[PDB]
Amino acid sequence: RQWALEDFEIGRPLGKGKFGNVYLAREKQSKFILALKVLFKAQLEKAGVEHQLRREVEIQSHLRHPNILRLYGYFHDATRVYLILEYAPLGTVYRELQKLSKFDEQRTATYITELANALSYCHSKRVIHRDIKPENLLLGSAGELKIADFGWSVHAGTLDYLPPEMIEGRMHDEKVDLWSLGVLCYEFLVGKPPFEANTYQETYKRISRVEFTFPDFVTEGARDLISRLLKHNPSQRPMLREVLEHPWITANSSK
């Protein structure tokens, strides 16, 4: 591996905002298709995220579930780092949700199932993702769910997906990704996150006071799982397989 830019032709833009952009792109000589994140070194340490990115490449690259987006290599030049990324043909989950505004229960449970395994794997290797936002949940071609982003940690922007203990600031562990699974689960069937407000200030309270309600079209099966995960006291939360085990899941997923 010694990649310099001229080893690629760049396709259409893929997004995003925060750090620069992510591009469709193609390895000139094997004709390989990939996402090529381009991040200006300019706005990197000019923001202090740099060292908290190295040990997120670290984290990204030696990992390997099929339900986790893979990082191939990297490089840079004058400005900008370049992340050479697996490509997720069917786009993000954020956009599938806007498109269909809600998910059926067969589809949700599958997405949750896939998320557990990828998290359950992440948690054997003791790794904790922090933001499991739908912006970070891409889709493979078989429509497999693939986790993606960059705020991971050791053991032990919107708060919509964070749990109480974080937002205020306490000794946290892998019990965060399980609250995020709850927040997600809800968002999928309802289409909006259970703590949404129009301000960061409401949302903090809605989270602090665990303040959500279910629209009628939501089944006491799912109420039970989401109720269970989104408890305040971290130790209250199912462990990852007690989740997969959940009656409501199993009745509704792939395998």
Ligand SMILES: CS(=O)(=O)Nc1ccc(Nc2ncc3cnn(C4CCCCCC4)c3n2)cn1
């Ligand atoms: C616009 S869309 O409706 O969402 N279609 C779409 C979305 C994603 C992809 N593929 C893809 N593969 C790997 C990665 C790694 N990071 N990204 C980020 C791209 C920057 C925008 C934010 C999303 C994630 C990736 N995107 C293809 N098509």
